[PDB]
Design an enzyme around this catalytic site. Structure first.
Site, PDB file in Angstrom:
ATOM      1  CE1 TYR A  71      80.384  34.294  -7.268  1.00  0.00           C
ATOM      2  CE2 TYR A  71      79.298  32.808  -5.745  1.00  0.00           C
ATOM      3  CZ  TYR A  71      80.448  33.298  -6.318  1.00  0.00           C
ATOM      4  OH  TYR A  71      81.671  32.799  -5.939  1.00  0.00           O
ATOM      5  CE  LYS A 111      81.661  31.128  -9.232  1.00  0.00           C
ATOM      6  NZ  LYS A 111      82.898  31.014 -10.074  1.00  0.00           N
TER       7      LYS A 111
HETATM    8  N1  LIG Z   1      81.581  31.428  -3.019  1.00  0.00           N
HETATM    9  C1  LIG Z   1      82.834  31.198  -2.312  1.00  0.00           C
HETATM   10  O1  LIG Z   1      82.852  30.635  -1.248  1.00  0.00           O
HETATM   11  C2  LIG Z   1      84.167  31.678  -2.874  1.00  0.00           C
HETATM   12  C3  LIG Z   1      85.268  32.148  -2.098  1.00  0.00           C
HETATM   13  C4  LIG Z   1      86.423  32.578  -2.761  1.00  0.00           C
HETATM   14  C5  LIG Z   1      86.498  32.541  -4.184  1.00  0.00           C
HETATM   15  N2  LIG Z   1      85.424  32.079  -4.892  1.00  0.00           N
HETATM   16  C6  LIG Z   1      85.514  32.030  -6.461  1.00  0.00           C
HETATM   17  O2  LIG Z   1      86.830  31.978  -6.864  1.00  0.00           O
HETATM   18  C7  LIG Z   1      87.118  32.956  -7.824  1.00  0.00           C
HETATM   19  C8  LIG Z   1      87.996  34.123  -7.355  1.00  0.00           C
HETATM   20  O3  LIG Z   1      87.547  34.737  -6.278  1.00  0.00           O
HETATM   21  P1  LIG Z   1      88.570  35.770  -5.175  1.00  0.00           P
HETATM   22  O4  LIG Z   1      88.246  35.319  -3.850  1.00  0.00           O
HETATM   23  O5  LIG Z   1      89.904  35.628  -5.744  1.00  0.00           O
HETATM   24  O6  LIG Z   1      88.040  37.245  -5.369  1.00  0.00           O
HETATM   25  P2  LIG Z   1      88.467  38.343  -6.518  1.00  0.00           P
HETATM   26  O7  LIG Z   1      87.512  39.467  -6.599  1.00  0.00           O
HETATM   27  O8  LIG Z   1      89.919  38.577  -6.365  1.00  0.00           O
HETATM   28  O9  LIG Z   1      88.250  37.635  -8.194  1.00  0.00           O
HETATM   29  C9  LIG Z   1      89.301  37.284  -8.894  1.00  0.00           C
HETATM   30  C10 LIG Z   1      89.554  38.063 -10.121  1.00  0.00           C
HETATM   31  O10 LIG Z   1      88.583  38.130 -11.068  1.00  0.00           O
HETATM   32  C11 LIG Z   1      88.876  39.085 -11.914  1.00  0.00           C
HETATM   33  N3  LIG Z   1      87.948  39.521 -13.004  1.00  0.00           N
HETATM   34  C12 LIG Z   1      86.739  40.119 -12.841  1.00  0.00           C
HETATM   35  N4  LIG Z   1      86.144  40.350 -13.973  1.00  0.00           N
HETATM   36  C13 LIG Z   1      86.946  39.890 -14.960  1.00  0.00           C
HETATM   37  C14 LIG Z   1      86.792  39.876 -16.375  1.00  0.00           C
HETATM   38  N5  LIG Z   1      85.701  40.402 -16.948  1.00  0.00           N
HETATM   39  N6  LIG Z   1      87.815  39.337 -17.131  1.00  0.00           N
HETATM   40  C15 LIG Z   1      88.895  38.830 -16.462  1.00  0.00           C
HETATM   41  N7  LIG Z   1      89.095  38.804 -15.132  1.00  0.00           N
HETATM   42  C16 LIG Z   1      88.101  39.356 -14.389  1.00  0.00           C
HETATM   43  C17 LIG Z   1      89.033  40.250 -10.941  1.00  0.00           C
HETATM   44  O11 LIG Z   1      89.637  41.337 -11.444  1.00  0.00           O
HETATM   45  C18 LIG Z   1      89.826  39.530  -9.791  1.00  0.00           C
HETATM   46  O12 LIG Z   1      91.173  39.780  -9.767  1.00  0.00           O
HETATM   47  C19 LIG Z   1      85.806  33.371  -8.322  1.00  0.00           C
HETATM   48  O13 LIG Z   1      85.325  32.529  -9.201  1.00  0.00           O
HETATM   49  C20 LIG Z   1      84.924  33.283  -7.110  1.00  0.00           C
HETATM   50  O14 LIG Z   1      83.607  33.182  -7.310  1.00  0.00           O
HETATM   51  C21 LIG Z   1      84.325  31.650  -4.248  1.00  0.00           C
END
Ligand SMILES: NC(=O)c1ccc[n+]([C@@H]2O[C@H](COP(=O)([O-])OP(=O)(O)OC[C@H]3O[C@@H](n4cnc5c(N)ncnc54)[C@H](O)[C@@H]3O)[C@@H](O)[C@H]2O)c1
Ligand SMILES: NC(=O)c1ccc[n+]([C@@H]2O[C@H](COP(=O)([O-])OP(=O)(O)OC[C@H]3O[C@@H](n4cnc5c(N)ncnc54)[C@H](O)[C@@H]3O)[C@@H](O)[C@H]2O)c1
Lengths: 282, 282
Positions: free
Chosen positions: B164, B168
């Site tokens: 991850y 990123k």
């Molecule tokens: N490290 C952190 O502090 C943090 C916190 C929240 C979100 N984030 C980032 O923000 C984004 C969303 O995270 P979230 O919190 O909404 O969780 P989440 O699991 O809802 O991810 C969002 C979406 O990604 C979609 N996805 C996965 N594989 C896919 C693919 N192959 N093609 C298309 N879509 C796909 C999933 O189905 C999901 O709906 C991500 O990039 C995540 O890394 C980071």
């Protein structure tokens, strides 16, 4: 900083910086497993050149594309066959420079594969070997040194090198995780961002004009340290090295925080604040 | 910051942060192409939820794995079919957390593929579309906004998330190159590092307890700005955003330079200097 009795794996070591690094470890007494693609080794005398031969000075060539699991497995097996894996210098790389809007999927994937996946496969294999060795020691310390190669391009994202920059930045983050996982076993994992005059940088840096200000040797001196017992207290660090200087990169700094005064930013207010900040800003 | 007449592509928009981002752009008048994998869209009402319906408010779902070239091509074609591509929010992601020494090749490759390759494919496709549009304009300005999603993990390399973190960090460097290539055409490309309470972060952040301090809305407010005309002077920037604050990350700083006094470091002297620096250092 004597490396007698140690075994080192250096990738991309047929020419350039990897070859200079393999020679510098050999000169300290390390047994070196030299890796590169086979076509690079066709045209290289590096194994003969590693007859330098004070110390055990043993060297063996292992040809393989580092982006392939089997190459990383063979390098590990070779090192175990020579008595154990002590030092890993991940250095292999390629460039496929292109303006982003002209960059093919293959140009992207190839650079990601050789730099980032190659670093991963050998870093992971080494990680599993060093941890298992520590468990076999009933919790005893293992000597392990990991030296991964990033680039200032990974900090900066230069035009025409989105794929190279992405791989090098990934390599840095990979190595920081490795440092956190492995430091407790006695492993040190560190990142270098070199500049060195090689046949592959000659177009950008020019040709060599004391000592060349961009000699590969300036980098080798740091890599020798980072591969040695003397670097036991250096782990998870990122260095920029070229010429007669080494620069420790600090953790990310924050330029400016933009806080709302209550529980949430009003969106039009946030817009006003950021727009004003960037109007008067270089 | 009205987005009437614009078309936005948001990936990973079936749930979580991507869904909140798609809704926030729709509320400003954008026509949203909602992308996610098809199984995510089976269980989502997001397209019905984007009946919010002041403004053109049009929304269409396009199912696909973002790591596949054909998904990026279909998203571009959908947006062109709706009148032109104006806004790209790359948000799709997965986690395959594992201690590095237990991490399989597949766990590594999958995370690299969805985050890094997915960001690339759509960033590159958009880059080629926006440049060609500017040339078709006989050198005229195009409106284009790119919002890529990195993470503080990419700055820090947390244990168990080498894959991850690597993805990123690569995303950040990719976006900086894109910003340098594309800013001259009128495109802005920026990076966000969010924290938001979603079903997928609920294990780490907890559940929601005014407004939730880790509401996705805190992030959406920034993304709305970065997607808008008002961000014309914001390009190549990296932001950390969560709660009622946005933090601009500064370019890399240097902790300390270690220079030899002559044309090269004596290697045992360099060793002595670094060893002393890190003995008395946290
Ligand atoms: N490290 C952190 O502090 C943090 C916190 C929240 C979100 N984030 C980032 O923000 C984004 C969303 O995270 P979230 O919190 O909404 O969780 P989440 O699991 O809802 O991810 C969002 C979406 O990604 C979609 N996805 C996965 N594989 C896919 C693919 N192959 N093609 C298309 N879509 C796909 C999933 O189905 C999901 O709906 C991500 O990039 C995540 O890394 C980071
Ligand atoms: N950005 C900079 O300022 C800068 C300058 C010099 C070196 N570097 C880095 O240092 C390293 C070496 O660079 P160099 O200057 O020696 O140039 P170089 O082209 O000699 O690269 C070194 C070696 O990599 C090998 N290699 C390529 N693909 C391989 C594969 N699939 N498997 C195994 N080996 C493979 C090549 O054959 C070559 O011998 C690279 O990581 C490079 O990015 C960076």
């Amino acid at each position: 900083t004597d490396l007698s009795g140690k075994v080192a794996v250096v990738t991309g070591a047929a020419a350039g910086l990897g070859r200079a690094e393999a020679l510098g470890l050999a000169r300290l007494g390390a047994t070196v497993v030299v890796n590169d693609v086979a076509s690079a080794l066709d045209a290289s005398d590096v194994v003969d050149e590693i007859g330098a031969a004070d110390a055990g000075a043993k060297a063996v060539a292992v040809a393989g594309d580092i982006s392939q699991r089997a190459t990383a497995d063979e390098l590990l097996a070779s090192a175990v066959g020579l008595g154990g894996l002590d030092i890993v210098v991940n250095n292999a790389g390629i460039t496929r420079d292109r303006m982003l809007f002209n960059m093919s999927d293959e140009e992207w994937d190839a650079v990601i594969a050789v730099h980032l996946r190659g670093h991963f496969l050998l870093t992971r294999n080494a990680a599993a070997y060093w941890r298992d060795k520590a468990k076999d020691a009933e919790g005893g310390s293992v000597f392990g040194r990991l030296v991964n190669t990033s680039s200032e391009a990974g900090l900066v994202g230069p035009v025409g090198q989105a794929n190279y920059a992405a791989a090098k930045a990934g390599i840095t983050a990979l190595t920081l995780s490795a440092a956190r996982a492995l430091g407790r076993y006695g492993v040190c994992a560190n990142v270098i961002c070199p500049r060195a005059r090689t046949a592959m940088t000659a177009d950008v840096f020019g040709a060599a004009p004391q000592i060349d200000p961009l000699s590969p040797q300036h980098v080798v001196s740091l890599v020798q340290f980072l591969a040695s017992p003397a670097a036991a207290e250096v782990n998870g660090q990122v260095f920029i090295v070229y010429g007669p200087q080494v620069t420790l990169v600090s953790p990310p700094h924050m330029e400016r925080r933009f806080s709302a005064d209550g529980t949430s930013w009003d969106p039009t207010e946030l817009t006003a604040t950021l727009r004003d900040y960037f109007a008067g800003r270089d």
